[model samples]
Target: VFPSSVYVPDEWEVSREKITLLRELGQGSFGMVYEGNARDIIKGEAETRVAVKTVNESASLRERIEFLNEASVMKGFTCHHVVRLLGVVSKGQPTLVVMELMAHGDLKSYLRSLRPEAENNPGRPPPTLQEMIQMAAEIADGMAYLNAKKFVHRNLAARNCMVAHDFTVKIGDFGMTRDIYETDYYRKGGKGLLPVRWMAPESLKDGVFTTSSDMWSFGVVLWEITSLAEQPYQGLSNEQVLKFVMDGGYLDQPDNCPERVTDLMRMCWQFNPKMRPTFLEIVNLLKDDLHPSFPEVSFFHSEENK
Candidate 1:
């Protein structure tokens, strides 16, 4: 049986009859996320697909609260690039949070399938440079929106961005999301929960988190997409990764990657969080420095041109 902390939160009364779990979609630290159904929303509407994140007994209360808060914050947003949070349900043991279901799963696999070596292969169409720029632009736009609302998404990486059947990017996994004012401190020398591979220097050294840090993570996400998902800063354990980040030199892209792109990524990893550019700045650079690879719009319509 699931632990008692898994009890449904007050005010989110949901009848069990309204839910119909389809199948297991994915699993993460919180619990299993499955494709499920609720009767309140129109079944055939544009946002019909719903993902249920079922929190296990061991999951912390803070994790559950963060998940619910993220769902609330996501309601007012309507960006094509950002994933939509539909609703949530709580029925105990299998307490669930509903969200937009992307059929293609996460960005990790797509990045792996991308071929930087065959960028110009007639037989094998590769993702173009412009496509990568478009993707960056979309991500920057999402970040800009979040920054405006004063909510810093602590976790933003390639793995968190979900891709639809047509390659629409939707940022997911907001378990670390929180507002700027309400602070919840973690115990020192506690079990580390941060995903260090994508963390900026300042965030790795101190507990400081800001929109700039999100941009830093975005740069790492860009690297993941551009490099066809080769593991970042290869040949290092998780602890070494944290040490390397704290001492600088956390990121290491492939040799074939463009010099300009690497330079931008490096800037994002700055030890001084204040030095990092805002999402607006990132958008401008993407439009100017990275415009050639992507057109004015729909630059990434196909995966043939990065």
Candidate 2:
């Protein structure tokens, strides 16, 4: 029997039960994301297109835990403006989290795609004021829900928000998040490190996170919307930018920005976190402030008269 087995390859031993790997569309800190589609194996072929975020077996325990935590948090949430979670993969080695795939990519790149003169522009038209308002309002609504649920999105930035082909926004990336109630135990002795330019003074000084801290980040997001997706500090180095922000320096809205809108943006970073408005409150104001140039209307009018 041993001699006979050595003469031929065993067909039964060759095992690939049933799983098909599909095309990859993107990659991130985790790993490559692929589209999984098999009509014969499963009905509704394209209806289940998902992003599989996989990490290597060599990945650290921390990395695995992060992905697991993300899955756990995502499982409990669902909103039009939040990324939807499908499930986890069953691969024997590296683990993968199945998520909704966005055709248009992240918010930063989406804005760049819109700007006609942006270096990477492909002739996509810029977002109209109405579009901006809609996007901002949707984002605010999502953040308000998170805050109400006792979670703090420590890293709320344009890069974390995903856009659909239809221009719908979905908040993504839960790696930098923290639940407010667990702050003391979670942040014990941890340095309050964040992008300085977007930090509220209190959050920068003490690692305290609140609705206000997120509001401070919203102000910067608003800036990114109008500035054609400029980085936090376009020309300033990291050190220079940090020093400026830590010293209470911030962006001076250019001539193009409206005063009232600038006023609202400035309030988000009052050098005192307590003064900042909640996302819900800010959304109401911005909603009412909507017009030709909002949330930049007030600032734009002054420029016209001047």
Candidate 3:
């Protein structure tokens, strides 16, 4: 039912009988996500809601490998800003990766639903400059953790991120992530699905991915946040987007977007990947801008002095 590379770690493996699929959450190119409930017998049948991502039965071998890679990558992380991988149901034909259910769903959809015309509006005002900045910091914190572990999240976008009930953003969708311990780039063997608009210029010209490429995508995610989920390069096709970026054109700063945050976004879009700031640098910069009151002096001191 599964390949040799698809073994779930001991602590992260779960009996399929323990989980009850409830309803469909969403679907993407590789698989379908479902809302599920898992019971803990030791806790007297305590049930916890979870998000189950299952590879489509008709999915290709490559898709299956990607799905397993996502689970494997997640198993190594234990950060609040990254989605928690509860366990995996590997006995079935299409394995299921269980994670903590994010009540608010993906950040992109959440932001869009806040638009003026969205049905049954919550009546809350759009996020303030401070809130938007904080979201960027939260995302950078998660990315910084991944960077420290030598991982490159090839798919770093708002659509791949989830938000909790308290508006805490968590990095998810690790299907494209990889561990590039000794290399600057993960070269692709062949063409595949990619978010062209959010991709860095180098990634567009060459099938390469690195932390810098992820940073480029992060910039687009920031734009998405400030613009209330407006699609990046709204009118451009893949070919046009690649050409536009090569010509040094980037998305215009969203209306009412703060200049301080826009400056950070610009740094992320530098034509040279080497010019883009590392995730730690990004975290520090965002903290300084968004949270000046209780600055983490130790965090800044350790990273900058070293």
Candidate 4:
């Protein structure tokens, strides 16, 4: 049975009768996400494509709460760089969350599929360096919006981001999000799961989660993009990875990756969380440094003055 926490107050609730699950998008920590078509009751009798996240029936109260909280937080956000929340379902079994469908799926898988060595090719070329940097900038923009609202997205990895049909990137997977002023640091009570490889050094050691920590994870995401979704700390066990991070070891720069990008990644992996750049700063850096030119037209006096 689903918990009451899964129910949003009024208009946010979506009726099950209107939803038809089409195909499973992917499985997450809580349950599964599916592509669905929903009837628009407010409009004409038309069906609209949407993504639905359904909780496992046997999920615990904490899991239910986390899922509900993610929906609640997401509904409050209205940014192009962040995934759009449609509504929620809680009146029956397998409570669901409806969101806009991202055509290209998760960013990590999308990147890997674009690699030249990919077993299957659809005749699509890899993204150019400028495109990759634009993606990074978009994610930073989303993170900056959340940070400005006093929210910390604890998980900021390539796998948690999605790509649209137009190649626009949007941040997702907010079940781990937390209010900034709620606690100085989220002390993991040995229950919840975390993506260790993408965690900041202080977070790995102290179990603290903050926007700066999210910035650190964003750096790893950038690395994944530059490396064509290569696994971070390839072949290292979790224990070894923790030790390696503590000992000042970091991921090596990918082939053909520019030095400026690597330099930004280095700033994110700083031993002190306070030393890391904020998401807004990262956004400015990416826009100004990576995409320097804008097409513009200028007019001057044509032979009127000597």
Candidate 5:
């Protein structure tokens, strides 16, 4: 019952019969997500466990098309760090987007649950600084790929990322957004939802979203990683963030956050989007900081300074 105005590529299409909705992981009243089984969506393997989300009858035509467009957009992603687009069941109604199963769920939840707490005895020791640094590198590498493709992620925080059982992080977001943390999303006039704290000031003011805007969000993601996935710009309301940030406010270096990383975060937060480092530069810097280690490098050195 959905409109067919959206052109889904042939290679990206999959038969609806191939997917079998399996054991439940609840979805919204009308929304659908599952621990589904897919037969031969990939090679050699007879079937694989996959996460499934259906656009359902409730979504507006615009919403339905946008969700399906994501499947089409994901078609070209071949990077190991970006979530693979298994297939799309767009031949008919109840459209479903199939993707590989991420055993550890979203990175935000996994990291927060890692910190042992006093109440429910919920915890695991936090990610070591090394592992956290590696997470940032992996994400930056993936973003570099997307940047080269000229796609503006718009949403690039830890919460939008997924973790594998092996702790590998991948950029994954679709109908996968959770309503549990309603505060993370903010509504502006008639534009759609904006993850306020993760948003850049220019975006908050002029409603502009470019690759550089994503870079700003990437900096916030870096902060989230070092702070054990804690929320960014804490103690501020969404409106306050919009006001203060437009007034030139920026997030402070989090407690125990490395000075080197904060240096980049501030760079991304620059008022002028052109001043933010490109993803290529980001990947190189983060990768170097991980090994052959930096003797406290200066980010202000011009790219042409060499």
Candidate 6:
């Protein structure tokens, strides 16, 4: 049936009884996410912590079906920086899409949480420059893997990714924007709100989405981490944001951000998609620059040296 129509392979099916929902993590207009546990989600692991995705009773048939499609994209992803899809509960009522749980939660909140510490309110220390760069590299690694597979994450930003307490960052959210806004419908008047601030000029103009457009979004995330998750396009309305990009205006390099990463960010925001660097190039630059800091990354040890 519906799962088959969405390309959700049968191997990922889980009995609804296997998942146990705990506290609701966040609730949205159409769906709710829960911090829950699963019996066999990791295949023989006992009671693993997971985030269960389920639509609300008010969800339309399309939203329910769209939930399945979200899990389908995550099913075969095999990267350390990509979130793991545990299984689906479509065979039974209250269908749930299960995913791995990142301890510190989404990157924006996680980074913002560290901000008061940055100025020494002192509960936890903020991430250092090197650490922030690693987070960016992890996202680049994930995007390169997705790019290799020809997948484009339509929404890519600090809020769309998750970070563990250990600073392990992963591209955790896919077509799951419904979770981020908490109390709003993902669509406005039957259309999704344009993420104008993170969108590339070409995408803002032509409604085009490609890996290059994703690169533009990735650069915005870079700025986010550097600014401790400050909102992009500050002091501008959505209409103002659109006009800014169309006029070749980009956000200024963040205060105190290093030039090397800023150069990479500039490359990502190039007006011509062809002028933008590849995700692999972004990964290589980040890894090469920080190889001394986190040399055990292991991709280069496999040695294709190019």
Q: Report the C-alpha lDDT of model 2 over 1-306, residue by residue, as the tens digit.
A: 111111111221111233245787666555666665322222455345556677756566666656555665566666556777666543345666667777778888888777766687767577766677777776776787677667887777787778876777767764663433421112324553345566666666666777888888888877887776777666876567666777888876744764555776788778777778877776676666354433342221223222
Model 4 per-residue lDDT tens digits across residues 81-105? 7888888887766778888889889
Candidate number with greatest lDDT = 3
Q: Residue by residue across 94-207, what tens digits does model 6's lDDT show?
A: 778888878778888788878874543338667776777788788887887787767888778887788865678988765635444532112334446667788899887877
Candidate ranking (TM-score, best to worst): 6, 3, 4, 5, 2, 1
**Which model scores highest in TM-score?**
6
Candidate 3 residues lying further than 4 Å off, grouped into runs, are 1-3, 6-9, 41-45, 60-66, 177-190, 288-306
For candidate 2, list the clashing residue pairs, or say none. Answer: 258-299, 258-300, 259-298, 259-299, 260-298, 260-299
Query: Candidate 5's residue-wise lDDT over 47-165, tens digit each?
Result: 98898888767678777777877677677767667778788888778888888887787877777777666242245567776777777777776677666666778888887788876
Error of 1 at 188 (Å): 9.0
Model 3 agreement with the true structure over 1-306: per-residue lDDT tens digits = 655574545877788898899999888546778998998823555998888888877778866776777677677777767888888877757788888889889988889888889884588987888888778887887787777777888888788789987787888765643333312223444664567778898988886899999999999999999898887887776667778987888999998788988998999999999999987788777666555432442233334324
Question: How many residue pairs clash per model?
Answer: 8, 6, 0, 0, 0, 0
RMSD of 1: 8.0
- TM-score winner, 2 or 3: 3
The superposed Cα distance between candidate 2 and the true structure at residue 152, in angstroms, equals: 0.8
- Displacement of residue 148 (Cα, Å) in model 2 is 1.3
All-Cα superposition RMSD per candidate: 8.0, 12.2, 5.8, 8.3, 5.8, 3.7
- The lDDT of each candidate is 0.66, 0.64, 0.78, 0.76, 0.74, 0.76
After the best TM-score superposition of candidate 4, give how far the Cα of residue 171 lies from its true spot, in angstroms: 1.0
Error in Å for residue 38 of model 3: 1.6
